[PDB]
Amino acid sequence: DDDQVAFSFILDNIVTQKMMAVPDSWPFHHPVNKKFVPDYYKVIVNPMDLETIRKNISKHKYQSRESFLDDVNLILANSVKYNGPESQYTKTAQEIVNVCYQTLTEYDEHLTQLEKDICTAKEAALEE
């Protein structure tokens, strides 16, 4: 029962303590306000930000690194398309991605254990 809660708990701390701690990362903490910036949402088909990711964590959307990294990489891919590949904002998003992979790698063996246990538990549960 503990494993999904623990994994989400770790992800959410990686976000708040490492990713949101990157200098000048504030533009990526919250969604672009669509009421104010409509052109953003005509350009970006799948907008993403760290707050949306935290909401996903709190709902336990991520059961492994891979779908979590999909949304994290999306924050960079969107920045590339809207701000340009050489933008200061994009360089900041690049750093957010790097610190993410750096942190996951530092805890690889622990996260792999959580992922295995989350996945075997869903197997046994549904079987039942």
**CB 78, min distance to ligand R78, A:** 7
- Residue of the chain from 22, 32, 76, 97 that contacts ligand R78 (CB under 6 A): 32
The answer to whether residues 47 and 78 touch, using CB atoms and an 8 Å cutoff, is yes
Closest CA to 12 of 48, 60, 47: 60
Degrees, nearest 5: CA angle 6-50-102: 65
- Residue of the chain from 55, 60, 91, 122 that contacts ligand R78 (CB under 6 A): 55
| 27 binds ligand R78 per the rule CB under 6 A | yes
Could you give the CA distance from residue 122 to residue 66 in angstroms, rounded to a whole number?
17
Interacting residues toward a second copy by CB under 8 A = 1-2, 4-5, 55, 58-60
Report the partner that residue 28 touches, choosing among a second copy, ligand R78, none (CB closer than 5 to 8 A by kind).
ligand R78
Closest CA to 53 of 35, 36, 78: 78
28 DSSP 8-state letter? G
Report the partner that residue 59 touches, choosing among ligand R78, a second copy, none (CB closer than 5 to 8 A by kind).
a second copy
Could you give the CA distance from residue 6 to residue 67 in angstroms, rounded to a whole number?
17
| 4 binds ligand R78 per the rule CB under 6 A | no
| 9 binds ligand R78 per the rule CB under 6 A | yes
Report the interface residues with ligand R78, using CB under 6 A: 2, 5, 9, 27-28, 32, 40, 51, 54-55, 58, 79, 82-83, 89
